[PDB]
Design a protein around this ligand. Structure first.
Ligand SMILES: NC(=O)C1=CN([C@@H]2O[C@H](COP(=O)(O)OP(=O)(O)OC[C@H]3O[C@@H](n4cnc5c(N)ncnc54)[C@H](OP(=O)(O)O)[C@@H]3O)[C@@H](O)[C@H]2O)C=CC1
Ligand SMILES: [Zn+2]
Lengths: 116, 129, 207, 146, 96, 335, 86, 137
């Protein structure tokens, strides 16, 4: 009974993946309209790779309820872009154009500060 | 006997991807689960009854203009309170933080006797009141 | 009377205890606990499956007529298995009384939307979603209401830091407003205020 | 009260010696490379180390691995402990095996060549607590000290 | 009182002054450094020691409710004077 | 030295980078990007300015409280220069002008003024000095702009031997006068060019790349007493490059030739303007001068900066010129 | 090249390390007399699977699990390292 | 000179005289360019081509567990035993006891205040030494 829980939308991972793919198609077909309405300086290929990167991060989830939430947030984040509730600043926050690269190796982190 | 249909989820409960915390502050942090030690300037024991969870200290530097204490750690002041140790570890595990647990330190019972102050042959006979 | 102590109203304490029992006898399937506070407020604690049954009964029954939803909010308690406590505050113009209905949930278990019972719940449930991350099933329009577009996290959770994770700024190079990790010129100072001496022995817990 | 020493005489920058033999500040890159070059030019018994009184276990193990990777085993400490016999092979040889809390269970204590009042004040405080309540017997072999 | 450093920058009553090679001094170019000229440590040293004829005297800072919390000072030691912990005034017992 | 400024923090807006820099000519095109990059990491920036204080307002939001400090300075006043540099660890010289005024000529701004800053910096004990020369600097050039650049590039190299001289090609950006120059010719009907734009090859570079190069030269110990050549990744003909600009701006393109002497004649006519002239005889020389190749000098790649193509960021600059995919122009392979 | 250090980990009450416990009790003093200059570190914690670490020149280490071994069977493992070196 | 961190500026393990292993926690970060002690060695090794196999504090404590497993059992007093084996070895060689008396290095309170770098840098420990030498005056 402990592992018996109420679902959000999908009763198993197989149905969850169906929602993930439909969401990906929605984002894939919107980038050309987004890059045009907001007059962005990125290309459509750069836009479509960012969507790919965002989906790739959460590729190790095995909880259908968690996947449902990620899709719910994705659909919310999508409705903001389509209806132009966001602004050019919000869309470009996925890219971090004004943040200097931060080193990933041990030696470089050693020279600058104390964080691991 | 609920009316709603239930499903089975045999996986570790992990919410690291829906809490919105940047990955910089999930993998490199080290939570500390503990019961606060009694403040030694006071005899009260009412601050040593709940379990706390704090994170590891990081750099504080001096503001060039005024001399204030600047920081870049967004978890410097975060303190959580828990009724028991088991509930504290549960919150750390599902949030993805690495943690250390320190067992509660309760003072051991002491044997007190006002009459020992005036012993006939023992070493506990005090010399002043 | 004592000039400095709030007076007690024993009449209203007996009437609200009778009605609390009255409600628990009619909905055993859902009511888990009924308590009346020392300042005469009534709390009905329910299983989360009874949000629609219990609320519909209180709105429509001839002896309840709680036709107005005063407020709907959530409280976050990290130490419980179900962190989030959902609170409904109701009003009755017919009998001039108030009542509080409480249920619970967690990060992943949804709760049924109350818009069918109270049209007032439309925006309150968006606010609970935006600030706590509690999903309400069958909501006509669920989305962030108070936070900024693209905001990550639910700021009213007890583990979300006070100053957040990012801060805004205008960058001249890119000619727009940018978001960056937050660094504070003066760190917020944390005061440990609680006294180590018990204040109220009436609320002492078993050791 | 000795914590205010952490605010004086502190080392804040890497330092190397210049041509006129005086220590001058430098970057981390310069200092480590100068040290790194010498460590590559030696091995075996040409490299040694000494550990002080306030060094942690993490640093002790790390330095050991660095010297081992140049095949050196001359890892020394400033505090002498006899190596004749079992030496540091058995922990029981160099520990307080009765534990601090076990002095309260003793009935006779023999102190040899030590002044616990100053080498370990809080452990001396425990002997007195046993000397007062449990009626302990204490003998000393050494100089008369209070 | 205010005394100037070898580089020409005034010293505050807390002892603060930028060293010669400290880059932070650039904030004062074409501007000034705010220093209060009334050093409180000097001002309270000019006040005369008040002679009293009791073992214990009380100080409230003057003005009654406009001063500081009322404290009682012991004057049993003739080696030194009795000093108020709030306002810094001094009291002494008359030859006994 | 007792100690350096000991950088602290995460490199953000409120950090301390240990850089106390005085930027001369920080109110122009290039200084607006250098000050931003210095303030974005928490540096102390002293900005000596000659103009009205209202014209330096866009620099205030570029740093935290007290990190941007403004002073008055005069080009010919040595005392004013000294006040601005005696507390600094690096001095950056961006003073320049594309035309001669009533009171300042190319000699005054490119030789005398850079020499005064360098000499006073040496006497004040500054450690790093960064001077901005031109790629096409040459004492045997038809442009008096480029002749003075060469003379100044030497007197600076003699007054401050450990100077990091940066020699960029024509820079392009939002506020540039290079791509914005080949878009306002539309106001005069057709696009004049010498030899129809042939015989001239240019290697323009991006503003941010030049700015990122300057910052890395401050932090790199291997840039003292060295000369660099910041050039773009491609070489174009002056014709197809202008052809590309009009394509991106989406404006009619009528390139008709005009002889050299005629261009100077119309060049002198604009010089009569008491305001910023639209064009000048000197400007025409540099626009029709081929960008040199100096393989023996280090470039951007030696400072860690990767050159940005003109195609990736041409739209960013020319978006405004559009009224109410463009094929890239041809390039000249390196043999 | 040559051997540098032998490390023996064992428990104090578990049966999985009873064999290693008997080896130390009976035939550790003889082993030390044979190799007085060899550091033989016997570090016994609580509830740990027993092991035998051996350190060779230039920081090479080889470890063989000693779980459920016996005194006669623990001698062979130490003979291997003392005789065969990497 | 490679500047390190004091015991109040690093999470480090110390073992007391009874074998109990405990750990400090970071109160303040080290001053200036000072760095955690084990990070200096782990950074010197990489620049020398001898990179060590641990990059984090949790990893360097796995290594400690290999060398001596009791160094990660925090607040546990692991017993040692084997006194008999230790006593038999000690008799294989004899040494002569010097005639000099046993004299502890610290005889009076005067010698207790300054015994390490930090206490020698303390201005409060210097006022304690002059107090027990001259007196209150
Ligand atoms: N822009 C480009 O394409 C190229 C730039 N360079 C060089 O880089 C440097 C920066 O030029 P840039 O910013 O792009 O163009 P700007 O003309 O916009 O910048 C010129 C700066 O120098 C100041 N200036 C001019 N004359 C004086 C004077 N007598 N006294 C004090 N200040 C003066 C100006 O101050 P104020 O505005 O108050 O008058 C201004 O801040 C120049 O030296 C230039 O030769 C070299 C190759 C390419
Ligand atoms: Zn007073």
């Amino acid at each position: 009974a402990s592992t018996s829980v109420k679902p959000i939308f999908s009763r198993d991972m197989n149905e969850a993946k169906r929602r993930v793919r439909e969401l990906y198609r929605a984002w894939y077909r919107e980038v050309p309209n987004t890059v045009h309405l907001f007059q962005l300086d990125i290309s459509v290929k750069q836009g479509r790779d960012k969507v790919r990167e965002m989906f790739k991060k959460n590729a190790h989830i095995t909880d259908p309820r968690v996947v449902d939430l990620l899709v719910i947030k994705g659909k919310m984040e999508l409705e903001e872009t389509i209806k132009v509730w966001k602004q050019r600043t919000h869309v470009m926050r996925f890219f971090h154009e004004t943040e200097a690269p931060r080193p990933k190796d041990f030696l470089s982190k050693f020279y600058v500060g104390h964080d691991p | 006997t609920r009316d709603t249909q239930l499903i089975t989820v045999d996986e570790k409960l992990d919410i690291t991807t829906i809490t919105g915390v940047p990955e910089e502050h999930i993998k490199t942090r080290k939570a500390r689960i503990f019961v606060p030690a009694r403040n030694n300037m006071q005899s009260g024991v009412n601050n040593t009854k709940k379990w706390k969870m704090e994170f590891d200290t990081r750099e504080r530097w001096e503001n060039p203009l005024m001399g204030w204490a600047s920081t870049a750690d967004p978890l410097s002041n975060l303190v959580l309170t828990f009724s028991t140790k088991e509930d504290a570890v549960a919150f750390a595990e599902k949030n993805g933080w690495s943690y250390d647990v320190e067992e509660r330190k309760v003072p051991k019972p002491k044997s007190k006797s006002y009459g020992a102050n005036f012993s006939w042959n023992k070493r506990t006979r005090v010399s002043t009141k | 009377t004592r000039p400095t102590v709030r007076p007690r109203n024993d009449v209203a304490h007996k009437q609200l205890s009778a009605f609390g029992e009255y409600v628990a006898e009619i909905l055993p399937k859902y009511v888990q606990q009924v308590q009346v506070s020392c300042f005469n407020e009534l709390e009905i604690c329910i299983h989360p499956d009874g949000v629609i049954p219990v609320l519909t009964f209180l709105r429509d029954h001839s002896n309840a007529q709680f036709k107005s939803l005063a407020d709907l909010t959530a409280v976050d308690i990290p130490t419980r298995q179900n962190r989030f406590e959902i609170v409904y505050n109701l009003l009755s113009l017919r009998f001039n009384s108030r009542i509080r209905v409480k249920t619970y949930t967690d990060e992943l278990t949804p709760i049924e939307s109350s818009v069918p019972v109270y049209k007032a719940a439309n925006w309150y449930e968006r606010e609970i979603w935006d600030m706590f991350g509690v999903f309400f099933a069958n909501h006509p329009d669920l989305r962030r209401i108070l936070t900024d577009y693209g905001f990550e996290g639910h700021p009213f959770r007890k583990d979300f830091p006070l100053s957040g994770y990012v801060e805004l700024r205008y960058d001249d190079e890119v000619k727009r407003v940018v978001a960056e990790p937050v660094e504070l010129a003066q760190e917020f100072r944390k005061f440990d205020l609680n006294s180590p001496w018990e204040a109220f022995p009436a609320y002492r817990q078993p050791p | 009260f000795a914590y205010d020493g952490l605010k004086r005489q502190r080392l804040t920058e890497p330092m190397v010696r210049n041509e006129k033999g005086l220590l001058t500040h430098t970057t981390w890159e310069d200092a480590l490379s100068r040290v790194a070059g010498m460590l590559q030019s030696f091995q075996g018994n040409d490299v040694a180390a000494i550990a002080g009184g306030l060094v942690d276990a993490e640093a002790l193990i790390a330095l050991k691995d660095l010297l081992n990777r140049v095949d050196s085993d001359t890892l020394c400490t400033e505090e002498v402990f006899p190596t004749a016999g079992a030496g540091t092979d058995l922990r029981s040889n160099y520990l307080l095996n009765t534990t601090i809390a076990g002095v309260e269970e003793a009935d006779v204590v023999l102190l040899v060549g030590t002044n616990p009042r100053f080498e370990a004040p809080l452990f001396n405080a425990r002997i007195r607590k046993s000397w007062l309540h449990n009626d302990l017997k204490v003998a000393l072999i050494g100089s008369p000290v209070d | 009182g205010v005394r100037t450093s070898p580089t020409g920058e005034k010293v505050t009553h807390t002892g603060q002054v930028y060293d010669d090679g400290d880059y932070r001094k650039v904030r004062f170019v074409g501007r000034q450094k705010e220093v209060n000229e009334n050093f409180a440590i000097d001002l309270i040293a000019e006040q005369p020691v008040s002679q009293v004829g009791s073992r214990v005297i009380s100080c409230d800072g003057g003005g009654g409710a406009l001063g500081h919390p009322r404290v009682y000072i012991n004057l049993d030691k003739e080696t030194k004077t009795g000093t108020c912990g709030y306002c810094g005034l001094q009291f002494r017992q008359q030859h006994h | 030295l007792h100690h350096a400024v000991i950088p602290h923090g995460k490199g953000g807006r409120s950090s301390v980078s240990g850089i106390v820099a005085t930027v001369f000519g920080a109110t122009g095109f290039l200084g607006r990007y250098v000050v931003n990059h210095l303030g974005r990491m928490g540096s102390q920036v002293i900005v000596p300015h000659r103009c009205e204080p209202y014209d330096t307002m866009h620099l205030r939001p570029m740093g935290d409280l007290g990190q941007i400090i403004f002073m008055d300075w005069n080009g010919r006043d040595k005392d004013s220069i000294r006040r601005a540099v005696e507390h600094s660890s690096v001095v950056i010289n961006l003073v320049g002008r594309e035309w001669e005024t009533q009171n300042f000529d190319f000699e005054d701004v490119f030789v005398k003024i850079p020499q005064a800053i360098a000499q006073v910096s040496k006497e004040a004990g500054v450690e790093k000095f960064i001077h901005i020369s031109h790629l096409n600097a040459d004492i045997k050039s038809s442009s008096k702009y480029l002749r003075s650049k060469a003379v100044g590039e030497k007197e600076v190299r003699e007054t401050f031997p450990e100077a990091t001289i940066i020699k960029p090609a024509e820079i392009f950006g939002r506020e540039d006068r290079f791509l914005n120059y080949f878009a306002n010719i539309r106001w005069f009907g057709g696009v004049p060019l010498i030899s129809l734009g042939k015989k001239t090859v240019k290697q323009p570079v991006y503003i941010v790349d030049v700015t990122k190069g300057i910052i890395n030269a401050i932090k790199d110990p291997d840039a003292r007493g060295k000369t660099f050549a910041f050039v773009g990744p491609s070489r174009y003909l002056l014709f197809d490059l202008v052809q590309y600009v009009f394509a991106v701006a989406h404006r009619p393109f009528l390139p008709y030739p005009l002889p050299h002497f005629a261009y100077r004649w119309i060049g002198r006519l604009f010089e009569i303007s008491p305001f910023e002239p639209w064009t000048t005889r000197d400007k025409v020389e540099r626009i029709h001068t081929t960008d040199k190749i100096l393989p023996h000098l280090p470039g951007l790649e030696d400072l860690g900066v990767e050159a940005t193509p003109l195609e990736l960021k041409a739209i960013e600059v020319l978006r405004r010129h559009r009224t109410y995919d463009v094929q890239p122009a041809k390039t000249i392979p390196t043999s | 090249l040559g051997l540098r250090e032998i490390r023996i980990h064992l428990c104090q009450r578990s049966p999985g390390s009873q064999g290693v416990r008997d080896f130390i009790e009976k035939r550790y003093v003889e082993l030390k007399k044979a190799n007085p200059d060899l550091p033989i570190l016997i570090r016994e914690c609580s509830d740990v699977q027993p092991k035998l670490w051996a350190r060779y020149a230039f920081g090479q280490e080889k470890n063989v699990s000693l779980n459920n071994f016996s005194a006669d069977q623990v001698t062979r493992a130490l003979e291997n390292v003392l005789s065969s070196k990497a | 000179i490679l500047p390190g961190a004091a015991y109040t500026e690093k999470s480090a393990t110390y073992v007391n005289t009874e074998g109990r292993a405990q750990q400090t926690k970071v109160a303040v970060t080290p001053p200036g360019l000072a760095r955690e002690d084990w990070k200096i060695i782990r950074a010197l090794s990489e620049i020398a081509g001898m990179t060590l196999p641990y990059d984090t504090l949790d990893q360097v404590r796995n290594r400690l567990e290999e060398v001596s497993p009791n160094l990660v059992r925090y607040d546990d007093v692991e017993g040692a035993n084997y006194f008999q084996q230790a006593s038999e070895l000690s008799k294989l060689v004899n040494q002569q006891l010097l005639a000099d008396p046993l004299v502890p290095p610290q005889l009076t309170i005067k010698d207790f205040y300054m015994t390490d770098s930090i206490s020698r840098a303390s201005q409060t420990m210097a006022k304690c030494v002059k107090a027990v030498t001259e007196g209150a005056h």
